[PDB]
PDB file of C-alpha atoms and ligand atoms in Angstrom:
ATOM      1  CA  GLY A   1      20.018  12.203   8.787  1.00  0.00           C
ATOM      2  CA  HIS A   2      20.811   8.752   7.350  1.00  0.00           C
ATOM      3  CA  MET A   3      17.377   7.147   8.030  1.00  0.00           C
ATOM      4  CA  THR A   4      14.729   7.159   5.264  1.00  0.00           C
ATOM      5  CA  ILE A   5      11.948   9.664   6.124  1.00  0.00           C
ATOM      6  CA  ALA A   6       8.781  10.846   4.295  1.00  0.00           C
ATOM      7  CA  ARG A   7       9.862  14.471   3.857  1.00  0.00           C
ATOM      8  CA  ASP A   8      12.826  13.261   1.713  1.00  0.00           C
ATOM      9  CA  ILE A   9      10.618  11.122  -0.638  1.00  0.00           C
ATOM     10  CA  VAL A  10       8.998  12.422  -3.847  1.00  0.00           C
ATOM     11  CA  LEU A  11       6.062  10.518  -5.312  1.00  0.00           C
ATOM     12  CA  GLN A  12       6.371   9.754  -9.052  1.00  0.00           C
ATOM     13  CA  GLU A  13       3.696   7.275 -10.139  1.00  0.00           C
ATOM     14  CA  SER A  14       0.455   5.638  -8.917  1.00  0.00           C
ATOM     15  CA  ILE A  15       1.065   1.843  -8.754  1.00  0.00           C
ATOM     16  CA  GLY A  16      -2.123   0.473  -7.220  1.00  0.00           C
ATOM     17  CA  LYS A  17      -3.711  -0.152  -3.859  1.00  0.00           C
ATOM     18  CA  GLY A  18      -3.528  -2.239  -0.757  1.00  0.00           C
ATOM     19  CA  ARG A  19      -6.392  -3.702   1.254  1.00  0.00           C
ATOM     20  CA  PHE A  20      -6.363  -0.143   2.768  1.00  0.00           C
ATOM     21  CA  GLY A  21      -4.159   2.643   1.426  1.00  0.00           C
ATOM     22  CA  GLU A  22      -3.022   3.698  -2.031  1.00  0.00           C
ATOM     23  CA  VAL A  23       0.371   2.657  -3.391  1.00  0.00           C
ATOM     24  CA  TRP A  24       2.874   4.915  -5.179  1.00  0.00           C
ATOM     25  CA  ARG A  25       6.383   4.606  -6.593  1.00  0.00           C
ATOM     26  CA  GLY A  26       8.584   7.324  -5.063  1.00  0.00           C
ATOM     27  CA  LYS A  27      12.211   8.383  -5.055  1.00  0.00           C
ATOM     28  CA  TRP A  28      14.458   8.711  -1.994  1.00  0.00           C
ATOM     29  CA  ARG A  29      18.025   9.999  -2.555  1.00  0.00           C
ATOM     30  CA  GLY A  30      17.926   8.714  -6.151  1.00  0.00           C
ATOM     31  CA  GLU A  31      16.550   5.247  -5.149  1.00  0.00           C
ATOM     32  CA  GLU A  32      13.083   3.930  -5.901  1.00  0.00           C
ATOM     33  CA  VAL A  33      10.865   3.056  -2.931  1.00  0.00           C
ATOM     34  CA  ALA A  34       7.181   2.014  -2.648  1.00  0.00           C
ATOM     35  CA  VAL A  35       4.886   4.119  -0.509  1.00  0.00           C
ATOM     36  CA  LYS A  36       1.468   3.107   0.822  1.00  0.00           C
ATOM     37  CA  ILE A  37      -0.528   6.197   1.808  1.00  0.00           C
ATOM     38  CA  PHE A  38      -3.422   6.219   4.295  1.00  0.00           C
ATOM     39  CA  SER A  39      -5.720   9.082   5.339  1.00  0.00           C
ATOM     40  CA  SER A  40      -6.017  10.382   8.955  1.00  0.00           C
ATOM     41  CA  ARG A  41      -9.270   8.394   9.420  1.00  0.00           C
ATOM     42  CA  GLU A  42      -7.380   5.136   8.507  1.00  0.00           C
ATOM     43  CA  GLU A  43      -4.837   5.550  11.394  1.00  0.00           C
ATOM     44  CA  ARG A  44      -5.831   2.212  13.022  1.00  0.00           C
ATOM     45  CA  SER A  45      -5.106   0.260   9.794  1.00  0.00           C
ATOM     46  CA  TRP A  46      -1.827   2.110   9.141  1.00  0.00           C
ATOM     47  CA  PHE A  47      -0.711   1.728  12.777  1.00  0.00           C
ATOM     48  CA  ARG A  48      -1.500  -2.002  12.920  1.00  0.00           C
ATOM     49  CA  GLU A  49       0.470  -2.647   9.713  1.00  0.00           C
ATOM     50  CA  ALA A  50       3.393  -0.507  10.992  1.00  0.00           C
ATOM     51  CA  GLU A  51       3.240  -2.555  14.265  1.00  0.00           C
ATOM     52  CA  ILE A  52       3.481  -5.886  12.435  1.00  0.00           C
ATOM     53  CA  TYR A  53       6.349  -4.700  10.230  1.00  0.00           C
ATOM     54  CA  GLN A  54       8.276  -3.500  13.273  1.00  0.00           C
ATOM     55  CA  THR A  55       8.088  -6.952  14.947  1.00  0.00           C
ATOM     56  CA  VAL A  56      11.492  -7.972  16.298  1.00  0.00           C
ATOM     57  CA  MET A  57      13.429 -10.311  13.942  1.00  0.00           C
ATOM     58  CA  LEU A  58      10.779 -10.167  11.187  1.00  0.00           C
ATOM     59  CA  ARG A  59      13.142  -9.307   8.292  1.00  0.00           C
ATOM     60  CA  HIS A  60      13.641 -12.059   5.755  1.00  0.00           C
ATOM     61  CA  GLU A  61      14.448 -12.277   2.047  1.00  0.00           C
ATOM     62  CA  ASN A  62      10.893 -13.502   1.362  1.00  0.00           C
ATOM     63  CA  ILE A  63       9.061 -10.838   3.437  1.00  0.00           C
ATOM     64  CA  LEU A  64       8.693  -7.358   1.890  1.00  0.00           C
ATOM     65  CA  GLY A  65      11.482  -5.131   3.228  1.00  0.00           C
ATOM     66  CA  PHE A  66       9.966  -2.472   5.490  1.00  0.00           C
ATOM     67  CA  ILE A  67      11.715   0.904   5.570  1.00  0.00           C
ATOM     68  CA  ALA A  68       9.569   3.267   7.636  1.00  0.00           C
ATOM     69  CA  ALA A  69       6.278   4.379   9.057  1.00  0.00           C
ATOM     70  CA  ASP A  70       5.940   8.207   9.019  1.00  0.00           C
ATOM     71  CA  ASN A  71       3.525  11.134   8.716  1.00  0.00           C
ATOM     72  CA  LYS A  72       3.609  13.843   6.030  1.00  0.00           C
ATOM     73  CA  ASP A  73       1.697  17.143   6.538  1.00  0.00           C
ATOM     74  CA  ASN A  74       1.213  19.005   3.247  1.00  0.00           C
ATOM     75  CA  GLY A  75      -0.153  22.134   4.974  1.00  0.00           C
ATOM     76  CA  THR A  76      -3.827  21.090   4.604  1.00  0.00           C
ATOM     77  CA  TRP A  77      -4.009  17.476   5.749  1.00  0.00           C
ATOM     78  CA  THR A  78      -1.739  14.754   7.081  1.00  0.00           C
ATOM     79  CA  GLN A  79      -0.964  11.572   5.178  1.00  0.00           C
ATOM     80  CA  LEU A  80       0.146   8.406   6.998  1.00  0.00           C
ATOM     81  CA  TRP A  81       2.876   6.581   5.162  1.00  0.00           C
ATOM     82  CA  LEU A  82       4.308   3.099   5.041  1.00  0.00           C
ATOM     83  CA  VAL A  83       7.528   2.907   2.995  1.00  0.00           C
ATOM     84  CA  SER A  84       9.053  -0.311   1.657  1.00  0.00           C
ATOM     85  CA  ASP A  85      11.506  -1.650  -0.896  1.00  0.00           C
ATOM     86  CA  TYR A  86      10.249  -1.188  -4.470  1.00  0.00           C
ATOM     87  CA  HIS A  87       9.868  -4.214  -6.769  1.00  0.00           C
ATOM     88  CA  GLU A  88       9.480  -3.386 -10.514  1.00  0.00           C
ATOM     89  CA  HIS A  89       7.558  -6.638 -11.298  1.00  0.00           C
ATOM     90  CA  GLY A  90       4.824  -5.816  -8.804  1.00  0.00           C
ATOM     91  CA  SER A  91       2.629  -8.646  -7.606  1.00  0.00           C
ATOM     92  CA  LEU A  92       2.767 -12.349  -8.386  1.00  0.00           C
ATOM     93  CA  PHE A  93      -0.735 -11.844  -9.881  1.00  0.00           C
ATOM     94  CA  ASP A  94       0.718  -9.255 -12.316  1.00  0.00           C
ATOM     95  CA  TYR A  95       3.830 -11.374 -13.058  1.00  0.00           C
ATOM     96  CA  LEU A  96       1.771 -14.544 -13.771  1.00  0.00           C
ATOM     97  CA  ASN A  97      -0.621 -12.612 -16.053  1.00  0.00           C
ATOM     98  CA  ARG A  98       2.327 -11.184 -18.065  1.00  0.00           C
ATOM     99  CA  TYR A  99       4.631 -14.215 -18.194  1.00  0.00           C
ATOM    100  CA  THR A 100       5.014 -17.966 -18.304  1.00  0.00           C
ATOM    101  CA  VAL A 101       7.702 -19.574 -16.161  1.00  0.00           C
ATOM    102  CA  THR A 102      10.168 -22.436 -16.640  1.00  0.00           C
ATOM    103  CA  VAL A 103      10.217 -25.440 -14.226  1.00  0.00           C
ATOM    104  CA  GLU A 104      13.145 -23.634 -12.481  1.00  0.00           C
ATOM    105  CA  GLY A 105      11.134 -20.330 -12.379  1.00  0.00           C
ATOM    106  CA  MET A 106       8.102 -22.129 -10.857  1.00  0.00           C
ATOM    107  CA  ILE A 107      10.178 -23.818  -8.111  1.00  0.00           C
ATOM    108  CA  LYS A 108      11.899 -20.477  -7.321  1.00  0.00           C
ATOM    109  CA  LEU A 109       8.501 -18.729  -6.875  1.00  0.00           C
ATOM    110  CA  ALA A 110       6.918 -21.562  -4.867  1.00  0.00           C
ATOM    111  CA  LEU A 111       9.972 -22.163  -2.667  1.00  0.00           C
ATOM    112  CA  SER A 112      10.461 -18.444  -1.894  1.00  0.00           C
ATOM    113  CA  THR A 113       6.733 -18.058  -1.001  1.00  0.00           C
ATOM    114  CA  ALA A 114       6.855 -21.104   1.338  1.00  0.00           C
ATOM    115  CA  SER A 115      10.130 -19.820   2.898  1.00  0.00           C
ATOM    116  CA  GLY A 116       8.556 -16.397   3.596  1.00  0.00           C
ATOM    117  CA  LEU A 117       5.443 -18.027   5.093  1.00  0.00           C
ATOM    118  CA  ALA A 118       7.489 -20.475   7.212  1.00  0.00           C
ATOM    119  CA  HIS A 119       9.483 -17.463   8.531  1.00  0.00           C
ATOM    120  CA  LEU A 120       6.236 -15.596   9.332  1.00  0.00           C
ATOM    121  CA  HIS A 121       4.725 -18.700  11.026  1.00  0.00           C
ATOM    122  CA  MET A 122       7.852 -19.633  13.035  1.00  0.00           C
ATOM    123  CA  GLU A 123       8.408 -18.433  16.604  1.00  0.00           C
ATOM    124  CA  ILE A 124      12.061 -17.441  17.204  1.00  0.00           C
ATOM    125  CA  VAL A 125      12.849 -18.124  20.831  1.00  0.00           C
ATOM    126  CA  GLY A 126      15.533 -15.922  22.389  1.00  0.00           C
ATOM    127  CA  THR A 127      16.562 -12.563  23.776  1.00  0.00           C
ATOM    128  CA  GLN A 128      15.380 -10.741  20.611  1.00  0.00           C
ATOM    129  CA  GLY A 129      12.446 -13.101  20.136  1.00  0.00           C
ATOM    130  CA  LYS A 130      10.041 -13.148  17.194  1.00  0.00           C
ATOM    131  CA  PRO A 131       6.407 -14.221  17.824  1.00  0.00           C
ATOM    132  CA  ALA A 132       4.723 -16.557  15.370  1.00  0.00           C
ATOM    133  CA  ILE A 133       2.549 -14.522  12.914  1.00  0.00           C
ATOM    134  CA  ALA A 134      -0.306 -15.664  10.658  1.00  0.00           C
ATOM    135  CA  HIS A 135      -1.087 -13.489   7.580  1.00  0.00           C
ATOM    136  CA  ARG A 136      -4.919 -13.977   7.221  1.00  0.00           C
ATOM    137  CA  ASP A 137      -5.052 -12.623   3.621  1.00  0.00           C
ATOM    138  CA  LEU A 138      -2.480 -14.495   1.523  1.00  0.00           C
ATOM    139  CA  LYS A 139      -3.098 -14.342  -2.221  1.00  0.00           C
ATOM    140  CA  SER A 140      -1.205 -13.765  -5.427  1.00  0.00           C
ATOM    141  CA  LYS A 141      -2.103 -10.015  -5.339  1.00  0.00           C
ATOM    142  CA  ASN A 142      -0.150  -9.398  -2.153  1.00  0.00           C
ATOM    143  CA  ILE A 143       2.952 -11.492  -2.947  1.00  0.00           C
ATOM    144  CA  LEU A 144       5.545  -9.444  -4.858  1.00  0.00           C
ATOM    145  CA  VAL A 145       8.158 -10.735  -7.314  1.00  0.00           C
ATOM    146  CA  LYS A 146      11.736  -9.435  -6.988  1.00  0.00           C
ATOM    147  CA  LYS A 147      14.149  -8.831  -9.880  1.00  0.00           C
ATOM    148  CA  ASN A 148      15.883 -12.174  -9.018  1.00  0.00           C
ATOM    149  CA  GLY A 149      12.645 -14.132  -9.648  1.00  0.00           C
ATOM    150  CA  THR A 150      11.922 -14.910  -5.973  1.00  0.00           C
ATOM    151  CA  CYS A 151       8.840 -13.730  -4.057  1.00  0.00           C
ATOM    152  CA  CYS A 152       8.270 -11.707  -0.949  1.00  0.00           C
ATOM    153  CA  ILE A 153       5.084 -11.576   1.140  1.00  0.00           C
ATOM    154  CA  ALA A 154       3.434  -8.141   1.554  1.00  0.00           C
ATOM    155  CA  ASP A 155       0.238  -6.489   2.990  1.00  0.00           C
ATOM    156  CA  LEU A 156       0.569  -7.640   6.592  1.00  0.00           C
ATOM    157  CA  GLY A 157      -2.202  -5.349   7.904  1.00  0.00           C
ATOM    158  CA  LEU A 158      -4.518  -8.238   8.824  1.00  0.00           C
ATOM    159  CA  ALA A 159      -1.834 -10.333  10.517  1.00  0.00           C
ATOM    160  CA  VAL A 160      -2.136 -11.807  14.015  1.00  0.00           C
ATOM    161  CA  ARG A 161       0.761 -12.435  16.449  1.00  0.00           C
ATOM    162  CA  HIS A 162       0.954 -15.275  18.975  1.00  0.00           C
ATOM    163  CA  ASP A 163       2.225 -15.307  22.587  1.00  0.00           C
ATOM    164  CA  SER A 164       3.239 -18.981  22.951  1.00  0.00           C
ATOM    165  CA  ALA A 165       3.453 -19.091  26.780  1.00  0.00           C
ATOM    166  CA  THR A 166      -0.332 -18.349  27.128  1.00  0.00           C
ATOM    167  CA  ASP A 167      -1.563 -19.471  23.653  1.00  0.00           C
ATOM    168  CA  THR A 168      -3.128 -16.018  23.134  1.00  0.00           C
ATOM    169  CA  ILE A 169      -3.303 -13.681  20.123  1.00  0.00           C
ATOM    170  CA  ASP A 170      -2.491  -9.912  20.280  1.00  0.00           C
ATOM    171  CA  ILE A 171      -5.872  -8.822  18.902  1.00  0.00           C
ATOM    172  CA  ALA A 172      -9.528  -9.935  19.061  1.00  0.00           C
ATOM    173  CA  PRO A 173     -10.052 -11.097  15.446  1.00  0.00           C
ATOM    174  CA  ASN A 174     -13.201 -10.434  13.463  1.00  0.00           C
ATOM    175  CA  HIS A 175     -14.728 -13.266  11.442  1.00  0.00           C
ATOM    176  CA  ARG A 176     -14.043 -13.589   7.680  1.00  0.00           C
ATOM    177  CA  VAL A 177     -11.627 -10.602   7.243  1.00  0.00           C
ATOM    178  CA  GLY A 178      -9.711 -11.638   4.127  1.00  0.00           C
ATOM    179  CA  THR A 179     -10.292 -12.159   0.408  1.00  0.00           C
ATOM    180  CA  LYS A 180     -13.353 -14.367  -0.060  1.00  0.00           C
ATOM    181  CA  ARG A 181     -11.938 -16.463  -2.962  1.00  0.00           C
ATOM    182  CA  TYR A 182      -8.955 -17.567  -0.825  1.00  0.00           C
ATOM    183  CA  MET A 183     -10.855 -18.188   2.459  1.00  0.00           C
ATOM    184  CA  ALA A 184     -10.243 -21.597   3.933  1.00  0.00           C
ATOM    185  CA  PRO A 185     -13.242 -23.979   4.259  1.00  0.00           C
ATOM    186  CA  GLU A 186     -13.355 -23.454   8.070  1.00  0.00           C
ATOM    187  CA  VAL A 187     -13.387 -19.670   7.569  1.00  0.00           C
ATOM    188  CA  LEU A 188     -16.218 -19.858   4.965  1.00  0.00           C
ATOM    189  CA  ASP A 189     -18.410 -22.020   7.208  1.00  0.00           C
ATOM    190  CA  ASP A 190     -17.341 -20.063  10.373  1.00  0.00           C
ATOM    191  CA  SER A 191     -16.349 -23.288  12.172  1.00  0.00           C
ATOM    192  CA  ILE A 192     -12.756 -21.980  12.649  1.00  0.00           C
ATOM    193  CA  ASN A 193     -11.714 -21.899  16.323  1.00  0.00           C
ATOM    194  CA  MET A 194     -10.278 -18.365  16.484  1.00  0.00           C
ATOM    195  CA  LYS A 195      -9.096 -18.941  20.104  1.00  0.00           C
ATOM    196  CA  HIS A 196      -6.361 -21.282  18.754  1.00  0.00           C
ATOM    197  CA  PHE A 197      -3.538 -19.452  16.869  1.00  0.00           C
ATOM    198  CA  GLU A 198      -2.735 -22.677  14.970  1.00  0.00           C
ATOM    199  CA  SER A 199      -6.135 -22.307  13.187  1.00  0.00           C
ATOM    200  CA  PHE A 200      -4.833 -19.135  11.475  1.00  0.00           C
ATOM    201  CA  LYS A 201      -1.537 -20.775  10.345  1.00  0.00           C
ATOM    202  CA  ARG A 202      -3.575 -23.668   8.867  1.00  0.00           C
ATOM    203  CA  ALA A 203      -5.915 -21.254   6.999  1.00  0.00           C
ATOM    204  CA  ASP A 204      -2.834 -19.513   5.462  1.00  0.00           C
ATOM    205  CA  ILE A 205      -1.606 -22.923   4.131  1.00  0.00           C
ATOM    206  CA  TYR A 206      -4.883 -23.524   2.274  1.00  0.00           C
ATOM    207  CA  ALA A 207      -4.462 -20.097   0.583  1.00  0.00           C
ATOM    208  CA  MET A 208      -0.803 -20.837  -0.265  1.00  0.00           C
ATOM    209  CA  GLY A 209      -1.982 -24.081  -1.944  1.00  0.00           C
ATOM    210  CA  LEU A 210      -4.276 -21.934  -4.165  1.00  0.00           C
ATOM    211  CA  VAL A 211      -1.357 -19.627  -5.026  1.00  0.00           C
ATOM    212  CA  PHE A 212       0.809 -22.707  -5.998  1.00  0.00           C
ATOM    213  CA  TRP A 213      -1.974 -23.761  -8.368  1.00  0.00           C
ATOM    214  CA  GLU A 214      -1.846 -20.278 -10.017  1.00  0.00           C
ATOM    215  CA  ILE A 215       1.942 -20.602 -10.486  1.00  0.00           C
ATOM    216  CA  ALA A 216       1.843 -24.214 -11.825  1.00  0.00           C
ATOM    217  CA  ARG A 217      -0.682 -23.232 -14.562  1.00  0.00           C
ATOM    218  CA  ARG A 218       1.954 -20.852 -15.975  1.00  0.00           C
ATOM    219  CA  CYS A 219       4.775 -23.415 -15.966  1.00  0.00           C
ATOM    220  CA  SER A 220       5.670 -23.886 -19.690  1.00  0.00           C
ATOM    221  CA  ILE A 221       7.251 -27.274 -20.700  1.00  0.00           C
ATOM    222  CA  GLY A 222       7.851 -27.808 -24.438  1.00  0.00           C
ATOM    223  CA  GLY A 223       5.703 -24.711 -25.069  1.00  0.00           C
ATOM    224  CA  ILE A 224       2.776 -26.292 -23.158  1.00  0.00           C
ATOM    225  CA  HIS A 225       1.074 -24.314 -20.351  1.00  0.00           C
ATOM    226  CA  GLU A 226      -2.383 -23.140 -19.174  1.00  0.00           C
ATOM    227  CA  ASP A 227      -3.646 -19.519 -19.414  1.00  0.00           C
ATOM    228  CA  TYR A 228      -3.644 -17.347 -16.278  1.00  0.00           C
ATOM    229  CA  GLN A 229      -6.678 -17.836 -13.990  1.00  0.00           C
ATOM    230  CA  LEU A 230      -7.581 -17.098 -10.387  1.00  0.00           C
ATOM    231  CA  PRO A 231      -8.477 -20.233  -8.286  1.00  0.00           C
ATOM    232  CA  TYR A 232     -12.207 -21.151  -8.766  1.00  0.00           C
ATOM    233  CA  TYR A 233     -12.483 -19.054 -11.995  1.00  0.00           C
ATOM    234  CA  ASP A 234     -14.512 -22.038 -13.360  1.00  0.00           C
ATOM    235  CA  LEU A 235     -16.985 -22.163 -10.409  1.00  0.00           C
ATOM    236  CA  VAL A 236     -17.714 -18.702  -8.948  1.00  0.00           C
ATOM    237  CA  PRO A 237     -18.281 -15.173 -10.312  1.00  0.00           C
ATOM    238  CA  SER A 238     -15.580 -12.451 -10.192  1.00  0.00           C
ATOM    239  CA  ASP A 239     -15.889 -10.820  -6.741  1.00  0.00           C
ATOM    240  CA  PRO A 240     -17.637 -13.886  -5.179  1.00  0.00           C
ATOM    241  CA  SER A 241     -19.644 -13.744  -1.949  1.00  0.00           C
ATOM    242  CA  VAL A 242     -18.930 -15.884   1.127  1.00  0.00           C
ATOM    243  CA  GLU A 243     -22.144 -17.873   0.289  1.00  0.00           C
ATOM    244  CA  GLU A 244     -21.008 -18.557  -3.332  1.00  0.00           C
ATOM    245  CA  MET A 245     -17.593 -19.702  -2.123  1.00  0.00           C
ATOM    246  CA  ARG A 246     -19.043 -21.792   0.740  1.00  0.00           C
ATOM    247  CA  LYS A 247     -21.421 -23.699  -1.617  1.00  0.00           C
ATOM    248  CA  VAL A 248     -18.444 -24.688  -3.827  1.00  0.00           C
ATOM    249  CA  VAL A 249     -15.689 -25.230  -1.245  1.00  0.00           C
ATOM    250  CA  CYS A 250     -17.612 -26.584   1.773  1.00  0.00           C
ATOM    251  CA  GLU A 251     -20.742 -28.187   0.330  1.00  0.00           C
ATOM    252  CA  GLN A 252     -19.787 -29.527  -3.119  1.00  0.00           C
ATOM    253  CA  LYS A 253     -16.208 -29.950  -1.786  1.00  0.00           C
ATOM    254  CA  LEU A 254     -14.502 -28.845  -5.024  1.00  0.00           C
ATOM    255  CA  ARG A 255     -10.975 -27.529  -5.370  1.00  0.00           C
ATOM    256  CA  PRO A 256      -9.095 -26.071  -8.394  1.00  0.00           C
ATOM    257  CA  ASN A 257      -8.633 -28.734 -11.085  1.00  0.00           C
ATOM    258  CA  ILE A 258      -5.262 -30.489 -11.350  1.00  0.00           C
ATOM    259  CA  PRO A 259      -4.617 -31.035 -15.116  1.00  0.00           C
ATOM    260  CA  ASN A 260      -3.457 -34.410 -16.497  1.00  0.00           C
ATOM    261  CA  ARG A 261      -0.277 -32.841 -18.019  1.00  0.00           C
ATOM    262  CA  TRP A 262       1.029 -32.192 -14.403  1.00  0.00           C
ATOM    263  CA  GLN A 263       1.541 -35.953 -13.845  1.00  0.00           C
ATOM    264  CA  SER A 264       4.092 -36.065 -16.759  1.00  0.00           C
ATOM    265  CA  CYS A 265       6.722 -33.847 -14.966  1.00  0.00           C
ATOM    266  CA  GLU A 266       8.403 -34.612 -11.577  1.00  0.00           C
ATOM    267  CA  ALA A 267       8.333 -30.912 -10.485  1.00  0.00           C
ATOM    268  CA  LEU A 268       4.599 -30.614 -11.395  1.00  0.00           C
ATOM    269  CA  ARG A 269       3.850 -33.958  -9.606  1.00  0.00           C
ATOM    270  CA  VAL A 270       5.537 -32.575  -6.418  1.00  0.00           C
ATOM    271  CA  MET A 271       3.622 -29.265  -6.722  1.00  0.00           C
ATOM    272  CA  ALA A 272       0.245 -31.060  -7.375  1.00  0.00           C
ATOM    273  CA  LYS A 273       0.772 -33.288  -4.309  1.00  0.00           C
ATOM    274  CA  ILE A 274       1.585 -30.181  -2.185  1.00  0.00           C
ATOM    275  CA  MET A 275      -1.659 -28.508  -3.369  1.00  0.00           C
ATOM    276  CA  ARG A 276      -3.829 -31.521  -2.471  1.00  0.00           C
ATOM    277  CA  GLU A 277      -2.194 -31.628   0.995  1.00  0.00           C
ATOM    278  CA  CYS A 278      -2.967 -27.852   1.507  1.00  0.00           C
ATOM    279  CA  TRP A 279      -6.624 -28.319   0.480  1.00  0.00           C
ATOM    280  CA  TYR A 280      -8.140 -30.702   3.085  1.00  0.00           C
ATOM    281  CA  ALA A 281     -11.306 -29.232   4.726  1.00  0.00           C
ATOM    282  CA  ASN A 282      -9.745 -29.956   8.121  1.00  0.00           C
ATOM    283  CA  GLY A 283      -6.791 -27.605   8.823  1.00  0.00           C
ATOM    284  CA  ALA A 284      -5.159 -30.111  11.230  1.00  0.00           C
ATOM    285  CA  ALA A 285      -4.613 -32.430   8.219  1.00  0.00           C
ATOM    286  CA  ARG A 286      -2.675 -29.853   6.097  1.00  0.00           C
ATOM    287  CA  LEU A 287       1.086 -29.652   5.532  1.00  0.00           C
ATOM    288  CA  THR A 288       3.035 -26.972   7.483  1.00  0.00           C
ATOM    289  CA  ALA A 289       4.915 -24.185   5.649  1.00  0.00           C
ATOM    290  CA  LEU A 290       8.183 -25.587   7.051  1.00  0.00           C
ATOM    291  CA  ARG A 291       7.419 -29.049   5.567  1.00  0.00           C
ATOM    292  CA  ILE A 292       6.560 -27.489   2.179  1.00  0.00           C
ATOM    293  CA  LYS A 293       9.808 -25.458   2.314  1.00  0.00           C
ATOM    294  CA  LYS A 294      11.799 -28.735   3.005  1.00  0.00           C
ATOM    295  CA  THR A 295      10.054 -30.539   0.085  1.00  0.00           C
ATOM    296  CA  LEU A 296      10.667 -27.715  -2.442  1.00  0.00           C
ATOM    297  CA  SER A 297      14.280 -27.251  -1.195  1.00  0.00           C
ATOM    298  CA  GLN A 298      14.924 -31.002  -1.911  1.00  0.00           C
ATOM    299  CA  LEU A 299      13.276 -30.484  -5.370  1.00  0.00           C
ATOM    300  CA  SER A 300      15.316 -27.249  -6.081  1.00  0.00           C
ATOM    301  CA  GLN A 301      18.587 -29.078  -5.094  1.00  0.00           C
ATOM    302  CA  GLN A 302      17.841 -32.050  -7.440  1.00  0.00           C
ATOM    303  CA  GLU A 303      16.712 -29.681 -10.285  1.00  0.00           C
TER     304      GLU A 303
HETATM  305  C1  J2M B   1       5.330  -2.329  -9.510  1.00  0.00           C
HETATM  306  C2  J2M B   1       4.810  -2.369  -8.100  1.00  0.00           C
HETATM  307  O1  J2M B   1       3.609  -2.333  -7.859  1.00  0.00           O
HETATM  308  N1  J2M B   1       5.764  -2.436  -7.128  1.00  0.00           N
HETATM  309  C3  J2M B   1       5.592  -2.548  -5.735  1.00  0.00           C
HETATM  310  C4  J2M B   1       4.338  -2.551  -5.100  1.00  0.00           C
HETATM  311  C5  J2M B   1       4.284  -2.731  -3.721  1.00  0.00           C
HETATM  312  C6  J2M B   1       2.986  -3.022  -3.078  1.00  0.00           C
HETATM  313  N2  J2M B   1       2.019  -3.674  -3.796  1.00  0.00           N
HETATM  314  C7  J2M B   1       0.948  -3.945  -3.004  1.00  0.00           C
HETATM  315  C8  J2M B   1       1.201  -3.467  -1.742  1.00  0.00           C
HETATM  316  C9  J2M B   1       2.505  -2.833  -1.802  1.00  0.00           C
HETATM  317  C10 J2M B   1       3.167  -2.149  -0.673  1.00  0.00           C
HETATM  318  C11 J2M B   1       3.812  -0.927  -0.840  1.00  0.00           C
HETATM  319  C12 J2M B   1       4.413  -0.307   0.243  1.00  0.00           C
HETATM  320  C13 J2M B   1       4.311  -0.959   1.449  1.00  0.00           C
HETATM  321  F1  J2M B   1       4.821  -0.375   2.558  1.00  0.00           F
HETATM  322  N3  J2M B   1       3.716  -2.111   1.667  1.00  0.00           N
HETATM  323  C14 J2M B   1       3.154  -2.699   0.603  1.00  0.00           C
HETATM  324  C15 J2M B   1       0.197  -3.613  -0.722  1.00  0.00           C
HETATM  325  O2  J2M B   1       0.228  -3.075   0.374  1.00  0.00           O
HETATM  326  N4  J2M B   1      -0.838  -4.407  -1.016  1.00  0.00           N
HETATM  327  C16 J2M B   1      -0.948  -5.258  -2.189  1.00  0.00           C
HETATM  328  C17 J2M B   1      -0.296  -4.662  -3.423  1.00  0.00           C
HETATM  329  C18 J2M B   1       5.477  -2.813  -3.008  1.00  0.00           C
HETATM  330  C19 J2M B   1       6.669  -2.766  -3.705  1.00  0.00           C
HETATM  331  N5  J2M B   1       6.754  -2.652  -5.043  1.00  0.00           N
END
């Protein structure tokens, strides 16, 4: 037929891993696609991610383009597949390690990330309605960079969907599910009210603020830039525990350092102010993704 299906895809190269599942580059009718493969015992993880990607009206330029969920039986065992668009640059983490960006490049990455998150967060009311969705594991490793230098959000397996008429969530969430380094203060200290969907949106904004800091460090002006680092590289070990993160983020109340050279550029001043306003301990005080999108759109227009 015309639809993309697993039996018509040939795996070519191992390209990493997801939270669950192993990622490959494959070919479908001459075109490159990305394939995330799960085992039969990981069906719940694969199914939940397939479910989120199939949400009505989810598609957006800054959300990874989902192609299919399928099974492939090789004659011995069955693999569970998720197929998506393939992006040669890979993650924002990979891109920022390999390259420095211009002021224009930085705004393009930050604006596209905020636009993808605002689309995920936004409820679309109508006949073909879209529920609001919170990611719960946003980080530079699961944001991908397209050939045009814009981002798209990926790895939606941990997402939660809201039913606005009842103020209920489609799953019963576990505590502290995501990447420890990017956990919001209220997630680290377990004070987050998980009965309020808005708490999850607010936790995603804190993580997006950390990602903006990673991008801004790589913004080169007159050959001046910082080296690549993960947020809190100066305060916690690699692979930090919840306790290590909590002591820094909740108790000492530290955030990634904003360098002095970011006050000398309008674009870096705007970005630094956005970061601070994503990093309050209280989620209710943070900026929304839609407000950040408006601010960077005004900045992109001017620059
Ligand atoms: C060069 C290069 O890696 N390209 C590339 C990688 C991915 C990819 N990277 C990650 C994930 C996925 C991915 C793949 C298929 C799919 F269905 N959902 C997601 C993922 O799940 N988790 C984080 C890391 C997607 C597209 N292009």
